[PDB]
Amino acid sequence: SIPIYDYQIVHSYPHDTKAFTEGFFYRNGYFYESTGLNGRSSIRKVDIESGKTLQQIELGKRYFGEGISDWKDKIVGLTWKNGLGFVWNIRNLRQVRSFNYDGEGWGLTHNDQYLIMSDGTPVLRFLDPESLTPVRTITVTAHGEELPELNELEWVDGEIFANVWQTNKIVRIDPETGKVTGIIDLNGILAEAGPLPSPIDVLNGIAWDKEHHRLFVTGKLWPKVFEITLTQRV
Ligand SMILES: [Ca+2]
C-alpha cells in the first residue's frame, strides 16, 4: 500500500571515510557537506569526482554542525543542540548572519519559498528565508502513524526526501499533508561500496541536482557517494 522503491547505482564516487555526514546538498557542479571530523564541525565544498575538499571552514568548538542547504547566494546550516543557525556566503564561506530557533537541528533543505528543517521528531519546520523563523509545520505520518527520526533532507521533484535515522530507508513526504507517499530502500547498498572502513556509520545524506535530475545518497564515514535512479518495486 505504501509504494517501495529500489535503487540502481548509476555512478559511485569516493567519499571521505572519516567524515560524519550531517548535511549534504548539490550545487554548481559541487557537493556541499556538513561534516563532523573528530568532534569538530566543518562545512565543506567537495569535488564530486575525487571526493576531495576544495574548501572548508571550521565551526567553533562549542557548535555541533548539522543540516545545510543553499539559499540563493548562501549556505544555511543548523546546529545539533545550540539553537543557533548560520548563514554563509556560498562563495567565500564567510559568516554573515546567525539566528536562533528552538529544539534540535537535524536536517535542512528548501523549496522555492522556504527553508525546511527536521529535528529527529515527526514534525518538519518551514522557515521564512528572511526572518528565519517557522511559518508552517507539518507532521509526518506513515500508514497514519507519526514517523520520528527524520534526519538529512532533500527536496526532490515536489517532495521532501528524508533519511530516517538508523534505518536504511529514505521516505518521500508529501509537503502538503506530511504523508509518506513512498519509501526508498537502500538496504544492502553498502555491499556495493567497495572495501569498508573501520569504523563505518549510518546512511545519511541526500543531494539532488534539479537541472539533470541526479540523486546522490551517502552516509556517515561511507567510502562512496552513490548516484542512484529509482525503480518502483514489483
Ligand atoms: Ca540534503
CA of 68 to the centre of ligand 1 (A): 7
Question: How many Cα neighbours within 13 Å face the side chain of 95?
Answer: 13
CA of 23 to the centre of ligand 1 (A): 6
d(CA 207, CA 187): 18
CA of 145 to the centre of ligand 1 (A): 24
Count how many domains the chain has: 1
CA of 44 to the centre of ligand 1 (A): 14
Strands 108-110 and 115-117: antiparallel
- Which cell is 204 given? 545519511
Place of cell 574548501: 55
CA of 195 to the centre of ligand 1 (A): 25
CA of 14 to the centre of ligand 1 (A): 18
For the chain, how many residues are written?
234
CA of 234 to the centre of ligand 1 (A): 28
Q: Go through 104-121 and write b for each residue having 16 or more CB atoms within 10 A of its CB, e for each that does not.
A: bbbbbbbeeebbbbbbbb
Which experiment gave this structure? Answer: X-ray
Question: How many Cα neighbours within 13 Å face the side chain of 19?
Answer: 29
- Which cell is 116 given? 525546511
179 vs 124, 145, 152, 205, CA distance in Å? 12, 9, 17, 21
Q: Which domain holds residue 95?
A: 1-234
Q: What is the three-state SS of 124-181?
A: EEEECCCCCCEEEEEECEECCEECCCEEEEEEECCEEEEEECCCCEEEEECCCCCEEE
CA of 25 to the centre of ligand 1 (A): 4
Identity of residue 127? L
Residues in Cβ contact with 204 at an 8 Å cutoff, skipping those fewer than 6 apart: 21, 22, 24, 151, 152, 163, 165, 218, 219, 220
Neighbour-count burial of 46, counting CB atoms closer than 10 A to its CB (0-12 exposed, 13-18 middle, 19+ buried): buried
Neighbour-count burial of 60, counting CB atoms closer than 10 A to its CB (0-12 exposed, 13-18 middle, 19+ buried): exposed
CA of 80 to the centre of ligand 1 (A): 16
3-state secondary structure of 4: strand
CA of 155 to the centre of ligand 1 (A): 8
